[PDB]
């Protein structure tokens, strides 16, 4: 009830043994009443590292998008080594969403080893189960076996109606995903452990399918963008091997489905200027000049009867003399060019200062023997050259024209494809302009460039007109156990990619959210802009180039920091050699580097002077000892991981304040949230995701099932808890309900339709759906709906939630008017009472933990000891936690070796990985998540609690209690003991 305190463990240890006398009864009682539950106690178990590889093929559905819906790919399996390293080899194949699926090495949900189907953004198939939401559901197939050598799996995705289907060895899989979210791009993905060999058969040259695709399902090789190539790659890496060693990479620039749909400018609506007869006629005539030049240059002639084979020009006259639809076509398109220029910031003009007289308008080619003679050319490029602004203007017009053309094709029903099929309404150019190839860009730009030259000749005066933030900055610091408070230190940083990279020394309390240099903790230098950031921007030195090495040297005794670029010491504006000075020692300093999106860089702390470059230039001469020179093991670095996690609300929060009004008279205990600085200076309001620390767990078996009636009190199974939204807080900005342990949606514009939900339907041999089930990560009801149903509200909205663990349904009731919305959940599910709110008033919300007639309070469900206590209570453990977007994480010392190379045109793209790799995982029971045991080096509270837990184990096992030793062997095994013995870190 109170929580984890090591003093209680010490009390139990004292209870075990006294002055060399072992109380067998006490030891057995403590063991029996503590260990079998395997709850409220840290658990450890060896697991395997799992990696994932995608095919670099991104597809998705959007309104007006230039992409095809149905898709189909295939993966074959060559070799599988089951039960390697004493664990079953993990192998799953499926699809994944770009925004939401981001596996990390170790320390995942459940007990680690996350792969395809361990989150609501991924859907997979392991051979016998359909993996989604970290829940495995068996599926019926003719040959039911795990993925074995010499078997092939065909995966098809239908985006028209959301569906993913699998087929193993031609036998259909009687189960399909459905009704999933379409907010992103779907790409093929395979998750695997060591000792496996798979091969992608992408399509066409990139392997051919063994089995024919289902009708309407195009091969996945037809979705490759023109500017990109088909090649396997990891999903999201934060490190990469290279000739210099481990290169730290930043975030990767992503793509969205809204980029494929084009949004042009409605230039046809713009009213044409009076220029139509003034200069538009001359522009069209100059275009006729260049047209005739094209015909003359080609083998084309001016023959009145149109004969392409004989290359005859229909008009066949120097002057175009074209019929009205022809002449009007030329004039209308010149007018369209004028409309586009007018719609943009440019303004048309005829002020040429009589440049028309100076224009030659004579090509004098003398090669026009046919009737379309006297080819004119103004030599406008010679008369005036195009300015760079004009060239960018040409690019803008070309982009707009392409966008309108694409919109037209989309309206008709065309889709992009790497292979052109006119009968199939597919072309390789429907992709919008920004992703075009340079050849097509030039082909679309040449005519507009000539038109702009004509405009210059005729004198045109046209003149050209939070959550994401965490995904741009990644911080790589050293561990807090490597802090240096004295001496001279040096470390180097090579800029492989130039831009948005800051390197320097930071204090151990460096937060993972605030940018480096914005706070006084980080004394960083940005070499992209040549500015040193300690608390604010200040120019210093010169910007670096590609491959430049910056050496950071720190004088702890002299209280200075010096930055050198390629050996040369960088100077400030005033000429000071040292970037900073008079710096207080304090807690210490640690090397730190931050990289932007798409930026890579090498970090050399100085483990070996041989690999340390430019050391003898400056660092060795003054006496700067390289950082981490004598230590044998490499420095364990900590990277900033952008994964939203729920953490307790700090009491020192300057914006939010959670107060316990528990023990109120004629009122159940409650926790009220208030805004400390509402309506004041620098006050910030934003989405707040709050939850309760302790969950409620449904029963394993769903076997149905004034003064309150005591019999009903004892035999009831329902639970009640309310949330009071205060007067002045708009109910339209609140959401009351429950959340599963897996929830990491830090959306500032959260809406009830943004939740993740996937329906798994398991069918029979006839295709009839025998079972239908839904998986969602949260269940809330919007208070805006209740307030709409019905200025300042002047009333308090008491939304009460009722949950039945016996049957598995939760139903809501707003203020007492009852809510028709209800949710059904699976057995063995733990839910946290949570609310999502946008603060707009001083008093916002109040979590009330109470009871109704014939209804248990939430405390009875939360605590086993008080399961039969009708009186509500708020023990110290129960607390309000808020979602935190960014947290610190530890980089694993070793990573898997995966080869993703294609074997041939027939074999496909072979992915192999055989080097075993394992780690010790520490599991938190209530949160249903695990983390690395080596991460306890900075988590001192958990380290102390686990040390006292081991001491308690030794205490209960003390003095020859062989039965207790055997009981312990179930929890802590020989493999765990030996791995902990060999664990150096």
């Amino acid at each position: 009830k109170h929580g984890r305190n090591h003093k209680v463990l010490d009390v139990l240890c004292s209870l075990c043994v006294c002055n060399g006398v072992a109380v067998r009864s006490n030891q057995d009682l403590i063991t029996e009443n503590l260990l079998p539950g395997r709850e409220l106690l840290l658990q450890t178990n060896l697991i395997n590292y799992v990696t994932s590889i995608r095919p670099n093929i991104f597809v998705g559905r959007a309104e007006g998008s230039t992409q095809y819906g149905k898709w189909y790919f295939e993966v074959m399996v060559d070799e599988v080594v089951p039960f390697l390293t004493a664990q079953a080899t993990h192998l799953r194949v499926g699809w994944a969403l770009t925004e939401g699926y981001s596996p990390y090495p170790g320390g995942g949900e459940g007990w680690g080893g996350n792969g395809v189907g361990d989150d609501l953004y991924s859907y997979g198939f392991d051979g016998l189960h359909l993996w989604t939401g970290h829940v495995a559901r068996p599926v019926t197939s003719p040959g039911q076996h795990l993925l074995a050598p010499e078997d092939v799996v065909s995966c098809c995705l239908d985006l028209s109606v959301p569906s993913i289907s699998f087929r193993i060895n031609g036998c259909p899989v009687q189960g399909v995903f459905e009704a999933f979210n379409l907010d992103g791009l779907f790409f093929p993905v395979v998750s695997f452990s060591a000792g496996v060999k798979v091969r992608f058969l992408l399509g066409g040259r990139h392997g051919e399918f063994k089995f024919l695709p289902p009708p309407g399902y195009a091969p996945c090789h037809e979705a490759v963008l023109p500017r990109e190539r088909l090649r396997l790659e990891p999903i999201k890496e934060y490190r990469r091997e290279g000739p210099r060693g481990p290169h730290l990479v930043g975030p990767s620039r992503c793509l969205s489905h809204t980029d494929f749909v084009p949004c042009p400018v409605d230039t046809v609506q713009i009213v044409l200027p009076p220029h139509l007869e003034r200069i538009r006629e001359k522009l069209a005539e100059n275009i006729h000049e260049l047209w005739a030049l094209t015909r003359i240059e080609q083998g084309w002639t001016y023959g009145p009867v149109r004969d392409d084979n004989k290359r005859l020009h229909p008009c066949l006259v120097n002057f175009h003399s074209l019929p009205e639809p022809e002449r009007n076509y030329n004039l209308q398109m010149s007018g369209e060019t004028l409309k586009t220029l007018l719609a943009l910031g440019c303004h048309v003009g005829m002020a040429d200062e009589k440049a028309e007289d100076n224009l030659k308008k004579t090509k004098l080619p003398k090669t026009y023997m046919m009737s379309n003679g006297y080819k004119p050319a103004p030599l406008d490029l010679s008369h005036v050259r195009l300015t760079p602004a004009q060239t960018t203007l040409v690019d803008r017009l070309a982009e707009n024209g392409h966008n309108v053309w694409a919109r037209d094709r989309v309206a008709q029903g065309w889709s992009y494809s790497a292979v052109q099929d006119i009968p199939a309404r597919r072309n390789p150019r429907l992709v919008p302009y920004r992703l075009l190839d340079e050849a097509t860009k030039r082909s679309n730009r040449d005519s507009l460039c000539q038109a702009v030259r004509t405009l210059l000749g005729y004198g045109y005066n046209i003149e050209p007109p939070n959550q994401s933030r965490w995904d741009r900055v990644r911080i790589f610091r050293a561990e807090k156990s490597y802090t240096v408070q004295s001496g001279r230190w040096y470390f180097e940083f090579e800029a492989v990619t130039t831009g948005e990279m800051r390197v320097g020394w930071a204090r151990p309390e460096l937060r993972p959210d605030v940018e480096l240099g914005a706070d006084e903790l980080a004394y960083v230098f940005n070499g992209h802009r040549g500015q040193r950031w300690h608390l604010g921007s200040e120019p210093f030195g010169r910007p670096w180039q590609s491959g430049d090495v910056v050496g950071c040297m720190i004088d702890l005794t002299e209280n200075t920091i010096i930055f050198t670029l390629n050996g040369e010491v960088l100077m400030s504006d005033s000429g000071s050699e040292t970037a900073f000075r008079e710096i207080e020692i304090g807690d210490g300093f640690l090397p730190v580097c931050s990289l932007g999106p798409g930026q890579v860089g090498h970090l050399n702390l100085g483990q070996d002077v041989s690999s340390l470059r430019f050391f003898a230039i400056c660092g060795l001469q003054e006496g700067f000892e390289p950082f981490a020179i004598n230590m044998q093991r490499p420095v364990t670095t900590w990277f900033s991981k952008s994964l939203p996690q729920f953490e307790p609300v700090p009491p020192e929060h300057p914006h939010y304040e959670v107060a316990r009004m528990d023990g109120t008279v004629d009122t159940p205990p409650c926790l009220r949230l208030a805004h400390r600085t509402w309506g004041s200076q620098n006050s910030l309001v934003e989405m707040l995701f709050l939850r309760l620390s302790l969950p409620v767990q449904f029963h394993q078996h769903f076997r149905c099932t004034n003064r309150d009636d005591p019999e009903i009190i004892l035999n009831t199974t329902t639970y009640y808890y309310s949330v009071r939204v205060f007067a002045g807080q708009e109910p339209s900005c609140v959401w009351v309900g429950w959340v599963t342990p897996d929830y990491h949606q830090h959306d500032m514009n959260f809406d009830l339709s943004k939740v993740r939900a996937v329906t798994v339907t398991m069918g029979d041999e006839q295709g009839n759906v025998h079972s239908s089930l839904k998986c969602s990560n949260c269940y809330m009801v919007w208070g805006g709906d209740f307030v709409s149903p019905g200025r300042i509200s002047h009333t308090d909205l008491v939304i009460g939630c009722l949950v039945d663990l016996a049957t598995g349904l939760m139903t809501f009731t707003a203020n007492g008017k009852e809510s028709n919305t209800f949710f059904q959940v699976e057995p063995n599910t733990k839910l946290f009472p949570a609310v999502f709110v946008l603060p707009t008033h001083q008093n916002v919300i109040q979590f009330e933990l109470g009871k109704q007639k014939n209804i248990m309070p939430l405390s009875a469900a939360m605590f086993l000891s008080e399961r039969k206590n009708p009186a509500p209570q708020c023990p110290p453990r129960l607390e309000v936690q808020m979602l935190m977007p960014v947290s610190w994480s530890r980089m694993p010392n070793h990573f898997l070796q995966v080869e993703t190379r294609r074997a041939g045109e027939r074999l496909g793209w072979a992915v192999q990985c055989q080097d075993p790799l394992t780690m010790m995982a520490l599991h938190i029971p209530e949160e249903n998540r695990c983390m690395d045991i080596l991460e306890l080096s900075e988590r001192l509270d958990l380290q102390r609690f686990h040390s006292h837990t081991l001491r308690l184990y030794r205490a209960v096992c003390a003095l020859g209690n062989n039965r207790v030793a055997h009981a312990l062997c179930s929890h802590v095994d020989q493999a765990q003991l030996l791995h902990a013995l060999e664990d150096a870190h």
Partner: nanobody, 126 residues
Framework: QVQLQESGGGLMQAGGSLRLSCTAS????????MGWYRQAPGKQRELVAT???????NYADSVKGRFTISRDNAKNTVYLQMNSLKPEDTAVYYC?????????????????????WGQGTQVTVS
């Protein structure tokens, strides 16, 4: 969106009379050069005589037999009449209205490729 409904070209022996009607329903702008093509079963697609506004007809390799093809801009209609027939004339014929006039577009690829295919009909010769 410009949709070119094409109806006609029923089966007939050699020398029969076949009438085909191509109507281009859609925006009146850029309605021109409602030309013709044919795709033979398992063969190459060939350009039939293309008629444009202004009574301009361009002939090509697919002018077998005797076509009489005439278009009216009032209702965007094209009447094609084959009075003779040959065994090699069996194909799926198509009618296309492109903003390209009289087969001319000395301009950007977007303007040139801006086009509107239709449905067509099957012509079979016994």
């Amino acid at each position: 969106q410009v949709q070119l409904q094409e109806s006609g070209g029923g089966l007939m022996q050699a020398g029969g009379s076949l009438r085909l009607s191509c109507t281009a329903s859609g925006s009146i702008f850029s309605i021109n050069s409602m030309g013709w093509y044919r795709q033979a079963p398992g063969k190459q697609r060939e350009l039939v005589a293309t008629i444009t506004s202004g009574n301009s007809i361009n002939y090509a390799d697919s002018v077998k037999g005797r076509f009489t093809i005439s278009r009216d801009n009032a209702k965007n209609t094209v009447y094609l009449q084959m009075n003779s027939l040959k065994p090699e004339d069996t194909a799926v014929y198509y009618c296309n209205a492109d903003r390209v006039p009289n087969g001319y577009n000395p301009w950007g690829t977007p303007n040139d490729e801006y086009d509107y295919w239709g449905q067509g009909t099957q012509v079979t010769v016994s």
